[PDB]
Amino acid sequence: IHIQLGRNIPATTPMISIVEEERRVTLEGYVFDKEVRELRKILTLKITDYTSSFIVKKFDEQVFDAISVGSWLKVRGSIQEDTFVRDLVMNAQDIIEVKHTPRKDYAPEGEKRVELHVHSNMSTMDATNSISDLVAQAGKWGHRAIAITDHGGAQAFPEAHSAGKKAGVKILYGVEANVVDDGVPIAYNDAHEALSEATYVVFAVATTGLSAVYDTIIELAAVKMYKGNVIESFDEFIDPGHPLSRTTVDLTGITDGMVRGSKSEEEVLRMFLEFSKDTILVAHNAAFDMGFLNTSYARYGIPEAANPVIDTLELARYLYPQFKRFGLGVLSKKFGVSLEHRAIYDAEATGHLAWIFVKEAMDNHNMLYHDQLNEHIGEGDSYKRARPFHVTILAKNQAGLKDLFKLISMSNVEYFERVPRIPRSQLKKMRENLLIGSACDKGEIFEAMMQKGVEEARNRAKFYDYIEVMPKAVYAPLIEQELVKNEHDLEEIIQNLVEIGKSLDKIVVATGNVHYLNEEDAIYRKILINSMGGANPLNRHSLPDVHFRTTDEMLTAFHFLGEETAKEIVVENTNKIADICEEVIPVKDELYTPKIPGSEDEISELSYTKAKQMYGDPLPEIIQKRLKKELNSINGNGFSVIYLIAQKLVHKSNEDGYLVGSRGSVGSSFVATMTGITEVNPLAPHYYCPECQYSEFFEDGTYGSGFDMPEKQCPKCGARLNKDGHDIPFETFLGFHGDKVPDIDLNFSGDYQAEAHNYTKVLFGEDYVYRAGTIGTVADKTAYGYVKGYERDNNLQFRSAEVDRLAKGATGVKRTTGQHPGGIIVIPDYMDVYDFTPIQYPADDQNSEWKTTHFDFHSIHDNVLKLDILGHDDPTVIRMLQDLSGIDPQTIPTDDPEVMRIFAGPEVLGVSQEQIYSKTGTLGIPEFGTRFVRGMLEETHPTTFAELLQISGLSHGTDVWLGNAEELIRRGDATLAEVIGCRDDIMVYLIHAGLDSGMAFKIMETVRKGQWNKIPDELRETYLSAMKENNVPDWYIDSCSKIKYMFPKAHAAAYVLMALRVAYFKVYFPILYYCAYFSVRADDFDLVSMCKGKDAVKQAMKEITDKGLDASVKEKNQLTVLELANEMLERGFKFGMIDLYKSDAVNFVIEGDTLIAPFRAVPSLGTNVAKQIVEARKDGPFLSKEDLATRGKVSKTLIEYMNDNGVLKDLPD
DNA sequence: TAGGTGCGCAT
DNA sequence: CCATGCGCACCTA
Ligand SMILES: O=c1[nH]c(NCc2ccc3c(c2)OC(F)(F)O3)nc2c(F)nn(CCO)c12
Ligand SMILES: [Mg+2]
Ligand SMILES: [Mg+2]
Ligand SMILES: [Zn+2]
Ligand SMILES: [Zn+2]
Ligand SMILES: [Zn+2]
Ligand SMILES: [Zn+2]
């Protein structure tokens, strides 16, 4: 429905202009953000006119909900400064929608262009629009196809595929690669002269620019050198007709008078031709000087003078690869040569070097002749010193896409130097199936035509498949940089490129170099670019207009070539290129899991062997049914390899002595329990006898867990009965019908995570396992910082709403690549990684031990296995506790009543709430020591394992406790054990009632996804009818209505089991528990208040607490560690200052009832130097107090900290 | 260079 | 008024 709020506005100032707190002002813009709050519902709209952004405030509620982002609104209200927000705000008594016509492509339906150069926000910090919206715009405009060519990557390929599907637009998959010429010769006119005895005319030119085509030399210098000594010198001035531009007068120390009277070039050129006879020409960047000289020669029909040449730049690059910059000044400085830039100086400088370079070439290598100077070219790190140029690579078919993935992977893994580089030889080998285009003004064809001439461009263009010409608006930065003098030269360059292409019979296309969608989005790019400072060369000049142009805009931009040629290169040739490519699929459709022979049989055998050992050869019918259904779902769907890999990883972890916990719903699987993957038993509560295999199950819902069951002795024999089972259906893990892909996230120890990764490498091979890769983008904090820095540098004053709009526009742009925390991606050995994704190094770190996938794992994890082998501190803490006490972690009673007391109060510990500042003794207990969870425990007083699982679900779920169950419990409507804590509980409760398995599963899925309201009326109706028909209370359905997100029961069971295992040691072995906690979990210690005693710890805690809610993350971590230290002190244990001999590098030591702090506790004692003092103390004592700093590498400062705190006092020096 | 600190991302 | 944890960017002694 039409959205209107107040009086009909008469059917508007630029928001930028309005600054007074005036009233009765019209203002219409675009709504880029919406937010309704509940008081009188208050409306806060951020609206923009692309000039500035203001905030419309309104106090109708149906309209409030109806207004949406992307709308156009006119308010005509009163600007009132007063607000919660300091900025001026608009109080709009009426807001009215307005219809804005979008950009349209006015060309005929069949005569639409294809945009072949598109940059998405996956071009790192270069483009700002998602490929999805660009593809949608192309679809709306009627374009038959569009290309996604990002700068060196293909990370937008999956999103581009989805968008092209949705929009009915063909996607051409390409990349803007940086290609480096594999072989750049050192010697040009190959000849068999002897370098040691030859005569060299080391020459140089001072020019009015860099374009040999469009400018000319003004000074010609040269020195004839022999045996390294000068023989003759030829210096001359050439006068251009035009006065020297101030740029030249400064770059080159030459003024118009300085060359006001000089010989004509024809004469100077003849003089140099005679002077440079039977000699080996020499130059720094000899291509540049030789091109200038040869163009000048040809200007007067003089012979090209093709004597042997040497380019000192290439020779220096080949001889001294260790160097980083090879310009003349840098090289002259390194080799101690002197230079002011006048041609004479340049020449003498090059000569003084060239002698050294030729001597090195003759001695250090076998290059005694001119020809031999080219033998070893393009071999080794040559790619690293070369200057890359832009090329466009498009996949023509699926094999072309695999080749493109290989090229990207090699440019990321083998030829990376500050950018992904492709050597031209590699691009030549894979060219079939690939379309190569000249890219932009940074491509080599445009560079040659604007700086070297038509013949060099027609030779380079021989290698491309099509030639790209962009509108003059894209090239404007060249005219601003003096690279192209004026628009006439630009038009000439573009026309020559069109002709060169027709001459060589190549497709010439107009591309556009799109970097953002609309002309108003340019600002975003600017901000991003500005954020790079001097790192980005684009900051030197102004950015072009690289928005997405329609067909008519492109035809207008190329009208200077004539209507026929423009219509050809814009519409016909682009669509020809599009038609050349067949439909390509960058992402697979099915899941390709690895194949391990005998996996289904192995999983079944393991499960049944463990089940027999635990429940006797005749298995209980309950266990028989469970195992049969689980294994039929697993082995039936080909999911046994997932279970087998998890089993092997956990088995190897257990052999090394580490417990593996789980996250998610793996604990819902009884096959996961029997195979050993998970510790959670999802069976119904029950007893089983460790000795005689007797078992007894309670499927009546009388106990929440087998742990809550009372102690009992075996009827068959005298042994005690082990109680297990938590009533977790497997449908939560395998879904109803068991067709769901199992997902087993395992929390291995932090120490052991690398071992598990390497074990995956062993299981599947080094070439088929890759660390899952993530793409980190510009988020709100970074975008806000970018906008603030931009406004500071440009000295503007943005309104908070604009700033927020500019931050939004620049958000989501790719900023870096990293690794997923625990995700290893496994490729089936019958395929290769390039069937799925390119590869790279995380953050482009070539020293990385693992390679990550180029694509974000979200785009590929449906087609290959992503092993979540995560690291958690709990298995580390439990391993340390086992080390410190010998107790096996799995023998710890998780049903102990005394331990559960810690969840009621601090007394079991032996301390008060008054002393430990906490009602509960769960401080330092994982997932239960937080203030929120501690408050929930205080308000609920759990006393059973089922109630602890409830607490986990309620504390971690969304909308499950704050407004849904805190009240129900406080008012006695339901007990803690009755409210909805975990998603499995909904199904369990409904099944225990009259509801059926399917209905209960559907209800639980709808509630856990927060779709109770989102589902249609008919569905909600069926569910409500069934629940009420079966005596399901009203408060239970009300709860379901308010739940946004719920967590699995197996997840909570695993985390509660770990917490109980740690709490056992906290209660019965306090010193061991505190030692393990501080050694593993605590990283930032004051240690001074800690070493003092309880009073200093309490004072530090009070300081942090009085710092208030506005406290740093470091302060909050310090508060946590200080709370633990205070609790430990209250219980009679104490900390001790570090000791050089006693203290460990990273672990607290136990001595009596005292914890000796490690070196890493000392403020900044560092960790490497920490191990150092450990290494030194075994060589010998630390005598003189100076010896310590000397060997250990202890920084005086730290020595001071130890000096005052008593550590070094021992030292008798 | 090695910590320290944000900050983004993920389970 | 969710917990925990990893990894890279950037700054600084
Ligand atoms: O957002 C998440 N928060 C948490 N908090 C920690 C937590 C600990 C114990 C729990 C628990 C949550 O839940 C439980 F009730 F099951 O027992 N964990 C995850 C995760 F593994 N994946 N995701 C993302 C899926 O949304 C989350
Ligand atoms: Mg020079
Ligand atoms: Mg997973
Ligand atoms: Zn770019
Ligand atoms: Zn480019
Ligand atoms: Zn480009
Ligand atoms: Zn028995």
PDB file of N, CA and C in Angstrom, chain A residues 628-684:
ATOM      1  N   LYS A 628      20.435 -49.790  14.323  1.00  0.00           N
ATOM      2  CA  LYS A 628      19.997 -50.137  12.979  1.00  0.00           C
ATOM      3  C   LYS A 628      19.532 -48.902  12.222  1.00  0.00           C
ATOM      4  N   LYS A 629      18.726 -48.055  12.863  1.00  0.00           N
ATOM      5  CA  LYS A 629      18.224 -46.873  12.170  1.00  0.00           C
ATOM      6  C   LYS A 629      19.353 -45.899  11.851  1.00  0.00           C
ATOM      7  N   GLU A 630      20.236 -45.648  12.820  1.00  0.00           N
ATOM      8  CA  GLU A 630      21.346 -44.735  12.578  1.00  0.00           C
ATOM      9  C   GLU A 630      22.227 -45.236  11.444  1.00  0.00           C
ATOM     10  N   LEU A 631      22.578 -46.522  11.468  1.00  0.00           N
ATOM     11  CA  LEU A 631      23.486 -47.050  10.463  1.00  0.00           C
ATOM     12  C   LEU A 631      22.823 -47.152   9.098  1.00  0.00           C
ATOM     13  N   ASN A 632      21.515 -47.397   9.049  1.00  0.00           N
ATOM     14  CA  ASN A 632      20.832 -47.388   7.762  1.00  0.00           C
ATOM     15  C   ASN A 632      20.786 -45.983   7.180  1.00  0.00           C
ATOM     16  N   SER A 633      20.580 -44.974   8.026  1.00  0.00           N
ATOM     17  CA  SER A 633      20.634 -43.599   7.541  1.00  0.00           C
ATOM     18  C   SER A 633      22.034 -43.231   7.065  1.00  0.00           C
ATOM     19  N   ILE A 634      23.062 -43.631   7.812  1.00  0.00           N
ATOM     20  CA  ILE A 634      24.428 -43.234   7.484  1.00  0.00           C
ATOM     21  C   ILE A 634      24.926 -43.988   6.258  1.00  0.00           C
ATOM     22  N   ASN A 635      25.058 -45.312   6.376  1.00  0.00           N
ATOM     23  CA  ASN A 635      25.590 -46.110   5.278  1.00  0.00           C
ATOM     24  C   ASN A 635      24.700 -46.037   4.047  1.00  0.00           C
ATOM     25  N   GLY A 636      23.401 -45.816   4.238  1.00  0.00           N
ATOM     26  CA  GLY A 636      22.509 -45.703   3.099  1.00  0.00           C
ATOM     27  C   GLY A 636      22.789 -44.477   2.253  1.00  0.00           C
ATOM     28  N   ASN A 637      23.158 -43.371   2.890  1.00  0.00           N
ATOM     29  CA  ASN A 637      23.386 -42.111   2.197  1.00  0.00           C
ATOM     30  C   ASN A 637      24.843 -41.883   1.829  1.00  0.00           C
ATOM     31  N   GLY A 638      25.719 -42.843   2.102  1.00  0.00           N
ATOM     32  CA  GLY A 638      27.133 -42.661   1.839  1.00  0.00           C
ATOM     33  C   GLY A 638      27.796 -41.626   2.722  1.00  0.00           C
ATOM     34  N   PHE A 639      27.425 -41.576   3.998  1.00  0.00           N
ATOM     35  CA  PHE A 639      28.020 -40.655   4.954  1.00  0.00           C
ATOM     36  C   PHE A 639      29.015 -41.332   5.883  1.00  0.00           C
ATOM     37  N   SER A 640      29.327 -42.606   5.648  1.00  0.00           N
ATOM     38  CA  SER A 640      30.197 -43.340   6.558  1.00  0.00           C
ATOM     39  C   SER A 640      31.620 -42.811   6.562  1.00  0.00           C
ATOM     40  N   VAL A 641      32.059 -42.170   5.478  1.00  0.00           N
ATOM     41  CA  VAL A 641      33.417 -41.642   5.441  1.00  0.00           C
ATOM     42  C   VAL A 641      33.572 -40.484   6.419  1.00  0.00           C
ATOM     43  N   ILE A 642      32.527 -39.677   6.596  1.00  0.00           N
ATOM     44  CA  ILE A 642      32.580 -38.594   7.574  1.00  0.00           C
ATOM     45  C   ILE A 642      32.796 -39.158   8.974  1.00  0.00           C
ATOM     46  N   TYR A 643      32.001 -40.165   9.336  1.00  0.00           N
ATOM     47  CA  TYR A 643      32.157 -40.806  10.635  1.00  0.00           C
ATOM     48  C   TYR A 643      33.526 -41.449  10.772  1.00  0.00           C
ATOM     49  N   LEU A 644      34.024 -42.074   9.706  1.00  0.00           N
ATOM     50  CA  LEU A 644      35.319 -42.744   9.783  1.00  0.00           C
ATOM     51  C   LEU A 644      36.455 -41.746   9.978  1.00  0.00           C
ATOM     52  N   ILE A 645      36.410 -40.612   9.277  1.00  0.00           N
ATOM     53  CA  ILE A 645      37.446 -39.602   9.452  1.00  0.00           C
ATOM     54  C   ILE A 645      37.397 -39.027  10.860  1.00  0.00           C
ATOM     55  N   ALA A 646      36.191 -38.730  11.360  1.00  0.00           N
ATOM     56  CA  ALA A 646      36.082 -38.238  12.728  1.00  0.00           C
ATOM     57  C   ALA A 646      36.603 -39.268  13.716  1.00  0.00           C
ATOM     58  N   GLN A 647      36.283 -40.540  13.483  1.00  0.00           N
ATOM     59  CA  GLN A 647      36.744 -41.608  14.356  1.00  0.00           C
ATOM     60  C   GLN A 647      38.261 -41.681  14.377  1.00  0.00           C
ATOM     61  N   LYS A 648      38.895 -41.598  13.208  1.00  0.00           N
ATOM     62  CA  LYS A 648      40.352 -41.662  13.155  1.00  0.00           C
ATOM     63  C   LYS A 648      40.987 -40.464  13.843  1.00  0.00           C
ATOM     64  N   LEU A 649      40.453 -39.265  13.607  1.00  0.00           N
ATOM     65  CA  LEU A 649      41.021 -38.078  14.236  1.00  0.00           C
ATOM     66  C   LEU A 649      40.910 -38.159  15.751  1.00  0.00           C
ATOM     67  N   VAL A 650      39.738 -38.553  16.254  1.00  0.00           N
ATOM     68  CA  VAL A 650      39.547 -38.637  17.696  1.00  0.00           C
ATOM     69  C   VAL A 650      40.378 -39.769  18.284  1.00  0.00           C
ATOM     70  N   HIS A 651      40.498 -40.883  17.565  1.00  0.00           N
ATOM     71  CA  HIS A 651      41.307 -41.997  18.043  1.00  0.00           C
ATOM     72  C   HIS A 651      42.770 -41.597  18.168  1.00  0.00           C
ATOM     73  N   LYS A 652      43.304 -40.908  17.159  1.00  0.00           N
ATOM     74  CA  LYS A 652      44.681 -40.438  17.245  1.00  0.00           C
ATOM     75  C   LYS A 652      44.845 -39.413  18.356  1.00  0.00           C
ATOM     76  N   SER A 653      43.861 -38.530  18.534  1.00  0.00           N
ATOM     77  CA  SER A 653      43.932 -37.574  19.632  1.00  0.00           C
ATOM     78  C   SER A 653      43.970 -38.284  20.978  1.00  0.00           C
ATOM     79  N   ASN A 654      43.146 -39.319  21.142  1.00  0.00           N
ATOM     80  CA  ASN A 654      43.101 -40.053  22.401  1.00  0.00           C
ATOM     81  C   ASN A 654      44.395 -40.817  22.644  1.00  0.00           C
ATOM     82  N   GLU A 655      44.993 -41.372  21.588  1.00  0.00           N
ATOM     83  CA  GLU A 655      46.271 -42.054  21.754  1.00  0.00           C
ATOM     84  C   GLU A 655      47.328 -41.106  22.300  1.00  0.00           C
ATOM     85  N   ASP A 656      47.384 -39.885  21.773  1.00  0.00           N
ATOM     86  CA  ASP A 656      48.317 -38.888  22.273  1.00  0.00           C
ATOM     87  C   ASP A 656      47.939 -38.376  23.653  1.00  0.00           C
ATOM     88  N   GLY A 657      46.765 -38.739  24.160  1.00  0.00           N
ATOM     89  CA  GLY A 657      46.381 -38.387  25.511  1.00  0.00           C
ATOM     90  C   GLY A 657      45.587 -37.105  25.606  1.00  0.00           C
ATOM     91  N   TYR A 658      44.688 -36.883  24.653  1.00  0.00           N
ATOM     92  CA  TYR A 658      43.886 -35.671  24.607  1.00  0.00           C
ATOM     93  C   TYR A 658      42.415 -36.027  24.465  1.00  0.00           C
ATOM     94  N   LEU A 659      41.550 -35.396  25.229  1.00  0.00           N
ATOM     95  CA  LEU A 659      40.113 -35.669  25.042  1.00  0.00           C
ATOM     96  C   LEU A 659      39.604 -34.736  23.951  1.00  0.00           C
ATOM     97  N   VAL A 660      38.743 -35.223  23.076  1.00  0.00           N
ATOM     98  CA  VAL A 660      38.166 -34.337  22.042  1.00  0.00           C
ATOM     99  C   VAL A 660      36.717 -34.079  22.408  1.00  0.00           C
ATOM    100  N   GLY A 661      36.333 -32.828  22.576  1.00  0.00           N
ATOM    101  CA  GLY A 661      34.929 -32.499  22.815  1.00  0.00           C
ATOM    102  C   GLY A 661      34.253 -32.272  21.502  1.00  0.00           C
ATOM    103  N   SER A 662      33.011 -31.839  21.525  1.00  0.00           N
ATOM    104  CA  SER A 662      32.249 -31.670  20.279  1.00  0.00           C
ATOM    105  C   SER A 662      31.422 -30.413  20.351  1.00  0.00           C
ATOM    106  N   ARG A 663      31.070 -29.882  19.208  1.00  0.00           N
ATOM    107  CA  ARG A 663      30.173 -28.734  19.134  1.00  0.00           C
ATOM    108  C   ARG A 663      29.116 -29.207  18.157  1.00  0.00           C
ATOM    109  N   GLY A 664      27.891 -28.758  18.284  1.00  0.00           N
ATOM    110  CA  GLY A 664      26.797 -29.127  17.411  1.00  0.00           C
ATOM    111  C   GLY A 664      26.069 -30.375  17.857  1.00  0.00           C
ATOM    112  N   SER A 665      25.650 -31.202  16.899  1.00  0.00           N
ATOM    113  CA  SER A 665      24.723 -32.294  17.169  1.00  0.00           C
ATOM    114  C   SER A 665      25.334 -33.671  16.941  1.00  0.00           C
ATOM    115  N   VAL A 666      26.659 -33.794  16.949  1.00  0.00           N
ATOM    116  CA  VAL A 666      27.250 -35.117  16.779  1.00  0.00           C
ATOM    117  C   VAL A 666      26.898 -36.013  17.959  1.00  0.00           C
ATOM    118  N   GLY A 667      26.818 -35.438  19.158  1.00  0.00           N
ATOM    119  CA  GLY A 667      26.479 -36.213  20.336  1.00  0.00           C
ATOM    120  C   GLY A 667      25.097 -36.826  20.299  1.00  0.00           C
ATOM    121  N   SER A 668      24.252 -36.407  19.359  1.00  0.00           N
ATOM    122  CA  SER A 668      22.943 -37.014  19.163  1.00  0.00           C
ATOM    123  C   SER A 668      23.023 -38.375  18.492  1.00  0.00           C
ATOM    124  N   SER A 669      24.197 -38.787  18.039  1.00  0.00           N
ATOM    125  CA  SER A 669      24.363 -40.040  17.321  1.00  0.00           C
ATOM    126  C   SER A 669      24.910 -41.101  18.263  1.00  0.00           C
ATOM    127  N   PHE A 670      24.206 -42.230  18.352  1.00  0.00           N
ATOM    128  CA  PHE A 670      24.704 -43.352  19.135  1.00  0.00           C
ATOM    129  C   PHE A 670      25.831 -44.081  18.414  1.00  0.00           C
ATOM    130  N   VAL A 671      25.852 -44.028  17.082  1.00  0.00           N
ATOM    131  CA  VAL A 671      27.003 -44.530  16.343  1.00  0.00           C
ATOM    132  C   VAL A 671      28.226 -43.671  16.623  1.00  0.00           C
ATOM    133  N   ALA A 672      28.033 -42.364  16.813  1.00  0.00           N
ATOM    134  CA  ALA A 672      29.134 -41.503  17.226  1.00  0.00           C
ATOM    135  C   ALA A 672      29.612 -41.841  18.629  1.00  0.00           C
ATOM    136  N   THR A 673      28.707 -42.281  19.505  1.00  0.00           N
ATOM    137  CA  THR A 673      29.116 -42.692  20.844  1.00  0.00           C
ATOM    138  C   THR A 673      29.885 -44.005  20.810  1.00  0.00           C
ATOM    139  N   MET A 674      29.409 -44.971  20.025  1.00  0.00           N
ATOM    140  CA  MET A 674      30.023 -46.292  20.004  1.00  0.00           C
ATOM    141  C   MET A 674      31.325 -46.294  19.219  1.00  0.00           C
ATOM    142  N   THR A 675      31.388 -45.532  18.130  1.00  0.00           N
ATOM    143  CA  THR A 675      32.636 -45.401  17.392  1.00  0.00           C
ATOM    144  C   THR A 675      33.686 -44.614  18.158  1.00  0.00           C
ATOM    145  N   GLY A 676      33.311 -43.957  19.253  1.00  0.00           N
ATOM    146  CA  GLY A 676      34.242 -43.213  20.068  1.00  0.00           C
ATOM    147  C   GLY A 676      34.365 -41.746  19.733  1.00  0.00           C
ATOM    148  N   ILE A 677      33.612 -41.257  18.749  1.00  0.00           N
ATOM    149  CA  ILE A 677      33.735 -39.865  18.330  1.00  0.00           C
ATOM    150  C   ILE A 677      33.301 -38.928  19.449  1.00  0.00           C
ATOM    151  N   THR A 678      32.176 -39.225  20.086  1.00  0.00           N
ATOM    152  CA  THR A 678      31.583 -38.337  21.070  1.00  0.00           C
ATOM    153  C   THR A 678      31.449 -39.043  22.411  1.00  0.00           C
ATOM    154  N   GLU A 679      31.505 -38.251  23.476  1.00  0.00           N
ATOM    155  CA  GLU A 679      31.288 -38.731  24.831  1.00  0.00           C
ATOM    156  C   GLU A 679      29.827 -38.681  25.249  1.00  0.00           C
ATOM    157  N   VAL A 680      28.987 -37.977  24.502  1.00  0.00           N
ATOM    158  CA  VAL A 680      27.579 -37.828  24.848  1.00  0.00           C
ATOM    159  C   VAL A 680      26.832 -39.091  24.450  1.00  0.00           C
ATOM    160  N   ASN A 681      26.135 -39.694  25.411  1.00  0.00           N
ATOM    161  CA  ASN A 681      25.307 -40.854  25.131  1.00  0.00           C
ATOM    162  C   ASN A 681      23.881 -40.386  24.895  1.00  0.00           C
ATOM    163  N   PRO A 682      23.366 -40.450  23.668  1.00  0.00           N
ATOM    164  CA  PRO A 682      22.015 -39.952  23.398  1.00  0.00           C
ATOM    165  C   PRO A 682      20.911 -40.933  23.742  1.00  0.00           C
ATOM    166  N   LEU A 683      21.243 -42.117  24.245  1.00  0.00           N
ATOM    167  CA  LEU A 683      20.220 -43.081  24.607  1.00  0.00           C
ATOM    168  C   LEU A 683      19.377 -42.548  25.762  1.00  0.00           C
ATOM    169  N   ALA A 684      18.230 -43.189  25.974  1.00  0.00           N
ATOM    170  CA  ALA A 684      17.382 -42.834  27.093  1.00  0.00           C
ATOM    171  C   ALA A 684      18.119 -43.113  28.397  1.00  0.00           C
TER     172      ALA A 684
END
